[PDB]
Amino acid sequence: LRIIWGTNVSIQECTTNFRNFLMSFKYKFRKILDEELYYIKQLNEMRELGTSNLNLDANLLAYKQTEDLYHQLLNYPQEVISIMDQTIKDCMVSLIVDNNLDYDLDEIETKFYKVRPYNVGSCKGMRELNPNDIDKLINLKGLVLRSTPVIPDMKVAFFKCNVCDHTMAVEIDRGVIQEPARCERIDCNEPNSMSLIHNRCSFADKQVIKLQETPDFVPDGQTPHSISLCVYDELVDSCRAGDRIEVTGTFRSKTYVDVVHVKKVSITDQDLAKIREVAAREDLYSLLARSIAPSIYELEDVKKGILLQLFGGTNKTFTKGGRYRGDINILLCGDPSTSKSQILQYVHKITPRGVYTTAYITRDVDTKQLVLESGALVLSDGGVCCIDEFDKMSDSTRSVLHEVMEQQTISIAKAGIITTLNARSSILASANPIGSRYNPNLPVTENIDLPPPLLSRFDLVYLVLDKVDEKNDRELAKHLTNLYLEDKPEHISQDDVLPVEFLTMYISYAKEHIHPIITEAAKTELVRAYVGMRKTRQLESMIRLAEAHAKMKLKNVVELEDVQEAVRLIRSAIKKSVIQRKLQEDLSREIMNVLKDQASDSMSFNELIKQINEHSQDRVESSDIQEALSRLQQEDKVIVLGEGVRRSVR
């Protein structure tokens, strides 16, 4: 029983249980947290292309035999990585000796293999990193801002006796390089001074990288932090400024994190069954729009737009030179003193990335490199970004939002830097109608003092005007005092409203599991929806709107009815007649003629709908036909007699 001082890790016992887990593991986490030999196939696959790296999922937690290994590697990673390098080589040579093979032992005897563990739980950034968590594994999610040029560190070093020329290679050991004093060979026995040569010595690459951290949860009063992480060999120039990066390594102490792995790429069954059962209902399209904000009012178009705005859409790209993102940039205008700021805060409390307001490249002289240093939109290269008081904003800063409207790029051309870079999220801007607060005697394009070029490129505008009257604002005051009726809203659960935790899980599952295609079948209704605004930015906005309609309700194929409402959306977002009486009159005359011309009067309403509307073009309002038949019910011309047969008077 070998016990290291201050360590509860035995070598041979952990070696045997690591080998027992490695020779036998077939998706046990899918059973207790089809295939066969989950680790034998990957290890037998990686040995031919030369990749010495092994990505390990800390599967070690759900396994029956290795629960004592996962609770041993979180406190001491430096010892377990060093003994894992020996055990992986031992189990690989045990795999070599089991089968017939060629000369592969000539290179694996001196080759080294390592392990990169990354599947660990989340933490609260650097704020939860107390001094009891030093030399432990930790994970940080955020964005990197500055990458120092790789610096060569000397793993080895050459020494030459300048008078007799015999060479000596020395290596590193905890940060010291012993410099030999005098020659020792037999040809140069004399005592003389050696010389260090470096242009012939291998160097470990080292690099310090600035990282802007952002956890899943942030405490009240906390500001974003800039952590200086440091990468080493075989991982240099793989992480650079501009990406949402999950990183993991060992927290050291000024404090830093020594990275063991980077991640440049990125629920239960009963919850998935509840999601599938709640996704089959018809009123889900309004249910969500009611459950997104139950403390306010209806706002169907506005709440439906912010719901599908956070649903996102479809972001498809080409192989080398093309990209497109399902995105909508929204603007709000109209009457003041309503829920606008509420929304502007609520969404900041929903997204994990966003600022309540662009970044800028800088030639950092210390490291001679083009770092980036930011916040606002730049930080939210994912999620949403909230801007209030759009009309009071200056004209010099409107040119950067003119590029992020549909191009999602930053083009800086200044002293020291000419760089175009990635910058796509979506804006949510609240504006005001100049001093007008909207006027009915002026057009919409002049009342808000907003330029036409920059507003036609806007994907969605919202007239959130009040237009105060009766039997509306009375319900507004009643709903605002209904939670003042009781001192505590414990009675908020008996209504059709989904909870927040179920809603974000359904939204996160739908955003990462559905890639809907826009078929050619919805072509005909799109053309005519475009010409009504024409009698390309609106078309690009409505296809992202239609694919977001397809993103909801668990659909992989877009449908013909889904664009109808989308257009109604953009037609309602910007907004008893005598002609309606004439419409009802000719509809009553036409329905009396087509109900009395045939012999078989026993014919229902659905057969009537498919027999009078298919010989002509698009759908007329069925509620007007219901009002016309109710008018004939009052004049005793037709008899309803149930929903299965519609017959006239005798």
Partner: protein, 260 residues
């Protein structure tokens, strides 16, 4: 070295002081110099805070030649590495083998510096609210979030030990006179004539109201904002003199590199 816990103190209140001094609310102008080493309870706003950082208390050195791990104690801001072996086995020996450091056996502490500022109505006439430094350690490291008023009780070298954040005869004799609202209305600012309604709403303005939280990510205001539009400063000065923190009307920091 084997300290599993952390020891801290807290002083007695004034209610335990009148019921048979040591804990008085002290200003930073009321420091005098000679209070360096007394426990003091300072009241003030906090403007500058720093991040939590691990500061070592004792440095642990390990050897492979003898096995006796040594521990040195640091007290200042800086220190020097003890490369020479001071063990009980290397003294009686010719060999004086290399020593290494351990970041695991060494005891650390969650150190954090903070700048307490002088209160607005407690500063004298003409003077400015100067600051003072407080050095905290351990579990008190997350009890200081900037933008608040605090009462810090600690020793003065400031090593804080306990923090907190925000008479019956005096309230009952004000209540028992009858017509409490009109008396409190006509009591404030009596050097002017009339206008009981405007200053009555000023009374409702400085009492504030109720902040409402829906608990679903939406906070509404529980405050009033009053305009005084008039034709051709005393009421404004009386409101700022009676109410606390009344004031008459972001940047990066390079040295420490942060958001001040």
């Amino acid at each position: 070295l084997t300290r599993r816990y952390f020891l801290y103190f807290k002083p007695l209140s004034q209610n335990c002081a009148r019921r048979y001094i040591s804990s008085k609310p002290l200003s930073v102008r009321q420091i005098k110099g000679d209070f360096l080493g007394q426990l003091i309870t300072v009241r003030g706003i906090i403007t500058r805070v720093s991040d939590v950082k691990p500061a070592v208390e004792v440095i642990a050195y390990t050897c492979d030649q003898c096995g006796y791990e040594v521990f040195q104690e640091v007290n200042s801001r800086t220190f020097t590495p003890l490369s020479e072996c001071t063990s009980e086995e290397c003294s009686q020996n010719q060999t004086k083998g290399q020593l290494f450091m351990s970041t695991r056996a060494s005891k650390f502490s969650a150190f954090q510096e903070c700048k307490i500022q002088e209160l607005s109505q407690q500063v004298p006439v003409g003077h400015i609210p100067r600051s003072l430094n407080i050095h905290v350690n351990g579990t008190l490291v997350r009890s200081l979030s900037p933008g608040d008023i605090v009462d810090v009780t600690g020793i003065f070298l400031l090593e804080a030990q306990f923090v907190r954040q925000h008479v019956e005869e005096r309230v009952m004799e004000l209540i028992t006179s009858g017509d409490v609202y009109n008396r409190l209305a006509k009591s404030i600012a009596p050097e002017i004539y009339g206008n009981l309604d405007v200053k009555k709403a000023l009374l409702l303005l400085l009492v504030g109201g109720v902040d409402k939280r829906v608990g679903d990510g939406m906070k509404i205001r529980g405050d009033i904002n009053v305009c005084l539009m008039g034709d051709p400063s005393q009421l404004l000065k009386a409101i700022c003199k009676i109410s606390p923190r009344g004031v008459y009307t972001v940047m990066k920091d390079p040295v420490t590199d942060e958001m001040i």
